[PDB]
Design a protein around this ligand. Structure first.
Ligand code: RH7
Length: 130
């Protein structure tokens, strides 16, 4: 229905706004573009599904997310990729792990405060009907 297409358009507006607020935070600059395969050629041998905030906006605009749950699976993949690629005790690995955990915690905190639980349930019920 037109009402259901209006529901998904409101979800995309919400997701673009959350993603922009994460992308302008200086702590999260390393997560804003894909890891350069020229400068880090081993990255795509270890990490089987790369993800970054520029790819997330492209996916919102391609209508890939029909729920906030499917958006949060990609925020979780950005964080888990950083923890698995950078697991060592040295300061550069510990700094990127702390920033990855902060990106995840910040996204979940904005959604807990600003997403109505009945708007998410409506998106889940339209998705399940398709
Ligand atoms: C989410 O970003 C990451 O997981 N990484 C790991 C890479 C390794 C290291 O820092 C990255 C980029 C880079 N470029 C040149 C030399 N070394 C590095 C960013």
């Amino acid at each position: 229905s037109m009402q259901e297409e209006d529901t998904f358009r409101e979800l995309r507006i919400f997701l673009r706004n959350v993603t922009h607020r994460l992308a302008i935070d200086k702590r999260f600059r390393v997560f804003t573009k894909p890891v350069d395969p020229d400068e880090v050629p081993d990255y795509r041998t270890v990490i089987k599904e790369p993800m970054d905030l520029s790819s997330v906006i492209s996916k919102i605009d391609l209508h890939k997310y029909l729920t906030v749950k499917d958006y949060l699976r990609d925020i979780d993949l950005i964080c888990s990729n950083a923890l698995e690629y950078n697991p060592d005790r040295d300061p550069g690995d510990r700094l990127i792990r702390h920033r990855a955990c902060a990106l995840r915690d910040t996204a979940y905190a904005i959604i807990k405060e600003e997403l109505d639980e009945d708007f998410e349930q409506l998106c889940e019920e339209i998705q399940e009907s398709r």
